[PDB]
Design an enzyme around this catalytic site. Structure first.
Site, PDB file in Angstrom:
ATOM      1  N   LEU B  39      56.212  38.904  47.939  1.00 25.16           N
ATOM      2  CA  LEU B  39      55.450  38.699  46.715  1.00 25.16           C
ATOM      3  C   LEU B  39      54.239  37.814  46.970  1.00 25.16           C
ATOM      4  CD1 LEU B  39      58.531  37.715  44.520  1.00 25.16           C
ATOM      5  CD2 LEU B  39      57.832  40.026  45.135  1.00 25.16           C
ATOM      6  N   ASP B  40      53.123  38.168  46.340  1.00 28.18           N
ATOM      7  CA  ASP B  40      51.887  37.412  46.456  1.00 28.18           C
ATOM      8  C   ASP B  40      51.813  36.345  45.361  1.00 28.18           C
ATOM      9  OD1 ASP B  40      51.350  39.124  44.262  1.00 28.18           O
ATOM     10  OD2 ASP B  40      49.540  39.966  45.138  1.00 28.18           O
ATOM     11  N   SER B  41      50.616  35.786  45.157  1.00 26.77           N
ATOM     12  CA  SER B  41      50.422  34.760  44.136  1.00 26.77           C
ATOM     13  C   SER B  41      50.544  35.335  42.728  1.00 26.77           C
ATOM     14  CB  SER B  41      49.058  34.097  44.326  1.00 26.77           C
ATOM     15  OG  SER B  41      48.013  34.957  43.881  1.00 26.77           O
TER      16      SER B  41
ATOM     17  N   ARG I  50      40.449  41.348  44.335  1.00 24.32           N
ATOM     18  CA  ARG I  50      41.001  40.359  45.258  1.00 24.32           C
ATOM     19  C   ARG I  50      40.136  40.199  46.505  1.00 24.32           C
ATOM     20  NH1 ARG I  50      46.358  42.070  45.779  1.00 24.32           N
ATOM     21  NH2 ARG I  50      47.203  40.535  44.306  1.00 24.32           N
TER      22      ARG I  50
END
Ligand SMILES: CCCCCCCCCCCCCCCCCC(=O)OC[C@H](COP(=O)([O-])OCC(O)COP(=O)([O-])OC[C@@H](COC(=O)CCCCCCCCCCCCCCCCC)OC(=O)CCCCCCCCCCCCCCCCC)OC(=O)CCCCCCCCCCCCCCCCC
Ligand SMILES: CCCCCCCCCCCCCCCCCC(=O)OC[C@H](COP(=O)(O)OCCN)OC(=O)CCCCCCCCCCCCCCCCC
Ligand SMILES: CCCCCCCCCCCCCCCCCC(=O)OC[C@H](COP(=O)(O)OCCN)OC(=O)CCCCCCCCCCCCCCCCC
Ligand SMILES: CCCCCCCCCCCCCCCCCC(=O)OC[C@H](COP(=O)(O)OCCN)OC(=O)CCCCCCCCCCCCCCCCC
Ligand SMILES: CCCCCCCCCCCCCCCCCC(=O)OC[C@H](COP(=O)(O)OCCN)OC(=O)CCCCCCCCCCCCCCCCC
Ligand SMILES: CCCCCCCCCCCCCC(=O)SCCNC(=O)CCNC(=O)[C@@H](O)C(C)(C)COP(=O)(O)O
Lengths: 117, 85, 53, 60, 107, 81, 144, 151, 134, 48, 288
Positions: B39-41, I50
């Site tokens: 999982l990312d931010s 991103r």
């Protein structure tokens, strides 16, 4: 839309809201009967009838008050003759409609009176 | 209602195994959300919001930064629900 | 209190009851009826007409 | 205060279902009874005259 | 600006530990005499509300505030009352109204 | 929270709304991770469907009401014709 | 502690006196900002608060006094009454300007007043001539 | 007399209410009560403020007291006339526009006469002030005509 | 025994914008399938940006916060038991020392409870002396 | 004057409001049994 | 006007949802919202002759339009029922201005009965659900509350104007006496639209709270074992069933005669079906 819209269009044809007759009666010269009342003012005041509900048949409303005070609070037994009182009001309403329709025809006659000269 | 720590643990692990970005295997209460998992931010916000719509209270941003594993998730839920058994 | 200690004319400060006229339907006693106390002095007497003075 | 998790309610008693059928029966019985015995309020108590085909000889 | 936030955080932590020490005291509670923990901000706020006049100087902004805030509505309201009562008094003393068609008979 | 379920009792393909939103997302080219979380709602066994809930809401006890109406028709003819 | 001991002093006019005033009010030197001495100013008092409200402050911070959302020796804002949680304070900022709400409301009211009082002289009416009453001397006839 | 069951029930409840209270009056309250006499208090006529001198204060008190008492007497005159009009309104419930018009005429005449005698004097109304008002009013109706016509 | 720190990061700002945007999005769309579809759409809109650098990320963050201020719902959905809801702090619990001011006849209704309370007063004064000193 | 009116309209509405208040209070016991000072709420509803 | 919350002093009722639910039932259903109408029933003799009648006939009709459009666009259960009280007050105050105090009182008593049951229901729903009352949370209560949902059904259709209920016996007599008497065109437009608006926001509240997907959250409690509430629910339920039935026969010593045409007589029922379908089928949400 509506009849008031025609009151904005044809004021000389359409009579308007709550109009007085503005005509001599018996213009057709038929046998128009005189509207009479069975009840008088004394028992009208004795029955405490309001000033708005003193129509030409207030004695049917007087009989409805008699049937209300005869069977109270169960007042669902007089309903049919209650309907009888409403029919008298309906007949009065029909006469009002009759007068209004007669009014329109007479103003239509006044229109060809404007074509008379 | 009446709560206990095992019910909070079962609820948190159930809704974490319902999450598809995490695999159902290799999931533990001591597992870190950032480097131990994929999982990312931004997915941590989805985990925190899933905690919010499950347990019925909203979680602030700094408390969301404070929580990094299911163990302190259980500790954070047990603090507001005040079970402590 | 409301039957024997009404606001009489001799004092101020009782519960002064003023009542309206009852209706009379057919089938009641004296159906052709005019309202009584039609003299002006009979309104709001509060027992002054029965006073010994 | 019973509670059920990730599922619907517990199965209700006989009293609530019997009461729900009683409420529905009373309301729909009153409504259908009044549509049978007094259907005159919906359409109109008296027939409205058209006031268009009235004869001119009657009204003058 | 980050070190300013850190210094403010350190001062806030010192005041928070002081509040947690003083507000939750056994011995101050055990005397039975009620009161308030020593707060400087409430005392400064109270004495700012009471002792404010010594920082007031005659300035055109303060004179304009005192003029259009208090004196000017008093002046227009007194003028309106005087004008209405003078017109009604002239009407009443001239003889333009009767004793039966007069407002506020107190009856 | 007394009877928590397992993670294997929730399947996306059972609920048709989750199936159609997953098919729409597959047409878009994206996937939803939290789609297995809402399997317990829209469940046809414990919860009702949309059409059955409306029929059990608006027309509830109407057979009982019609039976009471026919009972009042039957008893009212004996008293007053 | 009394009102004569703890009291707002004079206007500082000095960087050193400003620093001592910031140290007096438990306020960081960058934070302190005195009122301009315009006759209605507050000499030696910080200008604090003055946002869109005290309700704009986060309730999730562990305040020492949660009923006012303040710390222990944090000084009270100068207009603390007007900006309090009772009056004229919002959680989120408002969507539009202050004149927009009044302008839209008064425009809707002006339109409805104009439409209603323009249609006051033309009212809908059923085809009914006149209500009939027995005053003495009508000689009124039916259509029979 | 029991025309409807509701009226018969009301008569029964009124009889149950009426019985014990008239029993307690005629059996307990009306015995053991002594017959004492009280009288309505009557006053003489003190000389009016017209006969009073400027420096005399013993007679200005009597004139001011009879002025206050006459103001009180006229106050319940107007109050009794207003209650007569209100009892006319309640008793003639659908026909108060005919029966109560003469009673309203007497009430309006009484209010006009009350304001002519007592009006605009204020809180401190002495017998001197009403007499000065009456003198100035009679001077105005002598010179300029009646009040409200003009001039 | 830590308090939250008043600094904010760019990661914190993007996370808070994402959470507030999803809260506004679920306040706009009531049904869960439509909310999930719009959440994946917003996920794609936030995942597309991103790869940008810090300055364009700051500008896009400011534009997203401005646009979320423009499209904010008039009644956002909030939890009632948490802060900002209707049912927040429905009752106020007084501190326990008012229980210390009861009558002895009123204290006689819970004698075991008040003896336990006296034992915890001894334990609390021991704890306060060993924690905050004399 | 302190005045009371007894007509059919006032008596009917007064009976209806008393019936509504009685059934709301009989609701309110089960609604507010979780509350602390229910006696405060009920006496204040009675003065209302 | 300030007591009964009209234009523009109408903001204190969404404030009044912060009250507890039984006293909110007492305030909105009867008591404070009703009192302003009662004083104008007393002053109807002045209002039917003055320009205050025209002013109130505009203002309460605007309150009707604002209240119905508000309750169509609001996402709060208690605020929706407060807007429903406002719409009913606007309908009553408008009738009061053109005389008809007896018709206004006839709608007042029935409105007090049915509104209280809906408030008592709404509170029963909120107790069983966690306090939160956002209508996006509760979705499927028609099965889960078989008696509370039925009581909400009966009183909601009474507020709608389902024929031969306590709401219908005075709403039809309000809407037909205005159609036989003289009326402004704006006030005649505002009436039928508001009655349509009422079944629109009533059937929208039907689809949100009931007959749909339950959206409240992962942990919830839902039961119908409480009965001290439900006994008073049955009491006002029997009263809401036969309340206008007992009252229409005794409030009227002289029944009002209706001789409208068939389309104007069926206009209120037609706009009830149009608003019921339009307040429901629009509220259905699908993909895209
Ligand atoms: C006219 C119409 C109204 C006009 C306007 C009036 C004024 C405005 C309204 C005021 C309302 C009060 C607001 C209180 C707000 C609040 O939060 O209070 C906290 C406070 C918290 O109390 P608590 O600690 O939770 O205790 C709960 C009960 O009060 C525990 O019960 P208690 O022992 O405290 O009982 C209260 C006691 C108070 O006693 C007294 O005031 C002295 C009298 C003692 C007895 C004397 C016998 C002889 O009063 C009585 O016992 C008699 C009255 C009870 C209600 C009567 C209803 C009659 C039918 C309707 O709440 C109350 O006190 C609310 C209850 C109030 C009861 C009635 C008050 C009496 C005075 C009424 C005057 C009316 C006009 C004359
Ligand atoms: C300390 C308490 C002070 C209370 C207020 C003052 C009380 C005394 C007032 C006396 C003046 C007064 O009321 O005079 C009445 C008189 C009536 O007018 P009349 O007799 O009809 O004559 C026709 C006029 N053209 O009216 C007149 O003759 C009109 C007078 C007009 C001139 C008024 C001048 C006022 C000057 C400003 C004073 C207020 C501001 C002071 C500075 C404030 C700074 C912030
Ligand atoms: C104790 C601390 C200090 C307190 C300060 C505040 C005091 C407040 C109380 C003020 C007292 C009353 C002042 C006068 C009020 C008005 C009196 C009045 O009746 O004025 C009537 C007069 C009429 O004007 P005119 O045109 O002549 O009349 C034609 C009529 N056929 O109209 C006029 O004469 C109008 C012109 C004069 C208006 C004066 C307004 C003064 C405002 C402040 C000025 C400050 C200095 C600059
Ligand atoms: C068919 C159509 C027409 C009718 C319907 C429509 C109109 C009416 C609307 C309501 C309809 C019925 C609703 C029923 C709801 C439930 C009512 C009920 O009976 O509840 C039970 C009640 C309370 O039970 P519980 O919870 O145990 O309470 C503790 C003890 N009371 O327990 C009891 O009631 C039992 C105990 C009663 C004790 C008191 C009995 C009376 C004594 C004399 C009182 C005199 C008061 C005088 C003072 C005031 C008046 C001046
Ligand atoms: C005791 C009070 C009784 C009041 C009765 C009032 C009345 O006449 O109500 C009539 C109504 C039924 O009338 P409805 O069915 O509409 O028409 C009759 C069809 N042949 O009857 C009803 O709706 C039932 C009234 C029950 C009253 C219970 C009061 C407690
Ligand atoms: C109803 C509709 C309401 C919609 C509200 C939201 C609309 C806004 C969409 C417009 C596009 C944006 O605002 S994207 C905002 C900036 N996003 C960024 O990712 C900035 C650049 N990225 C970074 O700096 C990242 O490296 C970190 C540091 C954010 C990396 O991500 P972490 O793993 O979360």
């Amino acid at each position: 839309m509506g009849n008031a819209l025609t009151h904005y269009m044809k004021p000389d044809v359409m009579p308007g809201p709550d109009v007085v007759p503005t005509f001599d009666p018996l213009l057709g010269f038929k046998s128009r009967k005189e509207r009479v009342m069975i009840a008088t003012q004394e028992e009208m005041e004795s029955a405490k009838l309001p000033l708005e509900f003193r129509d030409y048949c207030a004695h049917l409303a007087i009989a409805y008050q008699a049937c209300r005070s005869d069977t109270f609070p169960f007042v669902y037994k007089c309903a049919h003759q209650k309907h009888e009182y409403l029919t008298c009001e309906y007949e009065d309403y029909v006469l009002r409609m009759k007068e209004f329709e007669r009014e329109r025809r007479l103003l239509e006659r006044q229109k060809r009176l404007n074509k008379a000269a | 209602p009446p709560l206990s720590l095992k019910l909070i643990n079962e609820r948190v692990l159930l809704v974490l195994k319902l999450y598809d970005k995490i695999d159902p295997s290799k999931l533990n209460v001591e597992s870190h959300f950032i480097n131990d998992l994929g999982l990312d931010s931004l997915d941590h916000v989805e985990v925190i919001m899933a905690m919010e719509d499950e347990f019925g209270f909203e979680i602030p941003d700094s408390d969301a930064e404070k929580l990094l594993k299911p163990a302190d998730i259980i500790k954070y839920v047990a603090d507001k629900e005040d079970v402590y058994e | 209190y409301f039957k024997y200690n009404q606001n009489d004319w001799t004092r101020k400060g009782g519960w002064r009851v003023i009542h309206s006229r009852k209706q009379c339907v057919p089938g009641d006693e004296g159906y052709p009826k005019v309202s009584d106390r039609s003299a002006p002095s009979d309104y709001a007497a509060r027992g002054f007409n029965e006073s010994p003075l | 205060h019973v509670v059920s998790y990730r599922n619907g309610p517990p199965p209700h008693s006989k009293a609530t279902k019997i009461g729900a059928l009683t409420v529905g029966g009373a309301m729909w019985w009153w409504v259908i009874w009044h549509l049978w015995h007094e259907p005159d309020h919906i359409t109109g108590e008296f027939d409205y005259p058209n006031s268009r085909k009235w004869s001119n000889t009657e009204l003058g | 600006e980050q070190e300013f936030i850190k210094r403010k955080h350190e001062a806030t932590l010192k005041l928070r530990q002081e509040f947690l020490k003083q507000s939750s005291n056994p011995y101050r509670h055990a005397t039975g005499e009620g009161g308030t923990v020593f707060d400087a901000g409430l005392a400064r706020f109270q004495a700012m509300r009471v002792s404010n006049y010594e920082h007031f100087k005659p300035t055109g902004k303060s004179f304009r505030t005192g003029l259009f805030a208090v004196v000017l509505p008093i002046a227009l309201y007194a003028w309106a009352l005087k004008a209405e009562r003078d017109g009604r008094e002239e009407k009443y003393r001239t003889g333009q109204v009767a004793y039966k068609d007069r407002q506020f008979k107190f009856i | 929270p007394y009877t928590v379920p397992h993670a294997s009792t929730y399947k996306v393909e059972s609920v048709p709304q989750l199936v159609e939103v997953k098919e729409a997302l597959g047409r878009q080219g994206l996937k939803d991770p939290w789609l297995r979380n809402e399997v317990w709602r829209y469940e046809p066994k414990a919860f009702g469907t949309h059409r059955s809930r409306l029929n059990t809401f608006l027309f509830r006890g109407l057979g009982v009401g019609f039976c009471a109406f026919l009972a009042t028709v039957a008893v009212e003819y004996a008293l007053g014709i | 502690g009394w009102n004569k001991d703890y009291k707002p002093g004079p206007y500082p006019q000095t960087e050193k006196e400003r620093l001592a005033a910031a140290k007096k009010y438990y306020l960081l030197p960058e934070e302190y900002k005195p009122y301009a001495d315009d006759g209605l100013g507050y000499g030696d008092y910080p200008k604090l608060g003055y946002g869109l409200g005290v309700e704009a402050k986060d309730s999730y911070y562990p305040w020492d006094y949660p009923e006012h959302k303040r710390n222990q020796h944090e000084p009270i804002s100068a207009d603390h009454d007007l900006y309090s949680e009772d009056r004229w304070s919002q959680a989120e900022p408002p969507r539009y300007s202050n004149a927009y709400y009044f302008a839209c409301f008064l425009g809707v009211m002006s339109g409805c007043l104009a439409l209603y009082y323009w249609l006051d002289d033309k009212k809908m009416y059923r085809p009914v001539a006149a209500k009939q009453y027995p005053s003495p001397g009508v000689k009124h006839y039916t259509f029979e | 007399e029991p025309r409807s069951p509701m009226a018969s029930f009301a008569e029964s409840v009124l009889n149950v209410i009426d019985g014990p209270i008239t029993w307690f009056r005629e059996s307990i309250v009306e015995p053991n009560q002594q017959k004492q006499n009280w009288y309505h208090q009557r006053f003489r006529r003190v000389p009016t403020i017209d006969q009073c001198y400027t420096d005399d204060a013993v007679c200005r008190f009597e004139a001011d007291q009879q002025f206050r008492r006459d103001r009180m007497v006229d106050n319940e005159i107007v109050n009794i006339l207003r209650q007569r009009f209100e009892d006319c309104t309640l008793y003639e419930a659908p026909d108060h526009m005919v029966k109560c018009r003469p009673l309203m005429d007497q009430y309006e005449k009484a209010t006009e006469n009350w304001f002519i005698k007592y009006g605009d004097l204020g809180g401190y109304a002495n017998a001197k002030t009403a007499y000065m008002k009456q003198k100035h009013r009679l001077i105005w109706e002598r010179r300029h005509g009646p009040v409200g016509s003009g001039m | 025994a830590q308090v939250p720190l008043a600094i904010v990061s760019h990661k914190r700002q993007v996370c808070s914008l994402y959470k507030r945007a999803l809260r506004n999005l679920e306040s706009w769309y009531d049904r869960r399938n439509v909310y999930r579809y719009r959440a994946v759409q917003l996920r794609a809109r936030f995942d597309e940006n991103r790869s940008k650098d810090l300055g364009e990320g700051i500008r896009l963050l400011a534009c997203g916060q401005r646009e979320l201020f423009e499209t904010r719902h008039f009644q956002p959905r909030n939890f009632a038991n948490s802060a900002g809801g209707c049912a927040f702090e429905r009752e106020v619990i007084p501190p326990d020392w008012v229980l210390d001011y009861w009558h002895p006849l009123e204290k006689a209704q819970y004698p075991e409870y008040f003896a336990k309370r006296e034992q915890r007063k001894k334990e609390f004064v021991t704890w306060w002396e060993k924690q905050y000193g004399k | 004057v302190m005045t009371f009116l007894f007509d059919w309209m006032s008596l009917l509405f007064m009976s209806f409001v008393l019936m509504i208040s009685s059934l709301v209070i009989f609701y309110s016991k089960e609604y507010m049994m979780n509350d602390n000072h229910i006696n405060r709420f009920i006496m204040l509803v009675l003065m209302f | 006007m300030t007591k009964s919350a009209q234009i523009p002093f109408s903001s204190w009722l969404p404030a009044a949802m912060a009250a507890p639910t039984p006293v909110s039932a007492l305030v909105h259903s009867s008591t404070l919202v009703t009192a302003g109408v009662y004083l104008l029933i007393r002053f109807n003799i002045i209002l039917s002759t003055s320009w205050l009648g025209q002013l109130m006939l505009l203002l309460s009709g605007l309150t009707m339009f604002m209240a119905g459009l508000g309750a169509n666009f609001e996402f709060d259960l208690k605020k929706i029922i407060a807007l429903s009280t406002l719409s009913q007050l606007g309908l009553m105050m408008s009738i009061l201005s053109m005389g008809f105090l007896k018709l206004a009182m006839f709608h007042l008593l029935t409105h007090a009965l049915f509104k209280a049951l809906l408030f008592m229901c709404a509170g029963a729903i909120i107790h069983n659900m966690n306090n939160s009352q956002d209508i996006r949370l509760m979705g499927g209560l028609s099965i889960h509350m078989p008696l509370t949902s039925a009581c909400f059904n009966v009183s909601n259709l009474a507020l709608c104007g389902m024929p031969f209920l306590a709401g219908f016996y005075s709403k039809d007599m309000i809407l037909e006496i205005v159609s036989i008497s003289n009326v402004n065109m704006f006030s005649f437009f505002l009436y039928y639209f508001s009655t349509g608006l009422t079944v629109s926001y009533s059937f929208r509240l039907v689809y949100y709270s009931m007959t749909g997907d339950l959206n409240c959250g992962s942990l919830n409690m839902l039961n119908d074992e409480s009965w001290i509430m439900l006994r008073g629910m049955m009491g006002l339920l029997i009263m809401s069933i036969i309340g206008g039935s007992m009252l229409n026969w005794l409030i009227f010593p002289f029944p009002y005669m209706i001789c409208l045409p068939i389309y104007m007589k069926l206009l209120t029922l037609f706009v009830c079906i149009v608003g019921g379908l339009f307040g429901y089928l629009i509220s259905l949400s699908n993909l895209f």
